[PDB]
Amino acid sequence: GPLGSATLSDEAFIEQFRQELLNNQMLRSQLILQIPGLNDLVNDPLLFRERLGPLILQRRYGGYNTAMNPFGIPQDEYTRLMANPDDPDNKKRIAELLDQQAIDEQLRNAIEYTPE
């Protein structure tokens, strides 16, 4: 089955990252040029974390992840629509979901040239 492992925290990701450089002589060698004192930080676990923490995390972090549907409906629901939007039932869901936008669209432009 899936049996993934997407959950490498800061220490988990940084702790494992340190093993990569130590496991890959070629990869590390490329960093030694940009970070000559790497062999030093690597030799130390605490420093490798603190000293090279902001560097390794810079890649992981960058912006909160997101992928919600525009119809604003339970992730489980959206899947049912695209999974079978031809179902006489789904049509109703996708039908009303667009209707709301049409109604709200009127407020956006609001042909009412008299706020008061």
| Residue-number span of the structural domain to which 73 is assigned | 63-116
φ, ψ for residue 102 (rounded to 5)?
-65, -40
Which residues, in sequence order, are CB contacts of 106 under 8 Å at separation 6+? none
Structure token digits, residue 8: 């490498």
**Same domain for 67 and 103:** yes
Overall domain count for the chain: 2
**Same domain for 111 and 97:** yes
Quote helix, strand, coil % in the chain, to nearest 5: 65, 0, 35
| Distance in angstroms between the alpha carbons of the first and the last residue of the chain | 61
Inter-CA distances, 88 with 17, 70, 80, 92, Å: 51, 21, 13, 7
Experimental method of this PDB entry: NMR
**Same domain for 40 and 16:** yes
Q: In terms of C-beta density within 10 A (0-12 exposed, 13-18 middle, 19 or more buried), how is residue 14 classed?
A: buried
**Same domain for 30 and 42:** yes
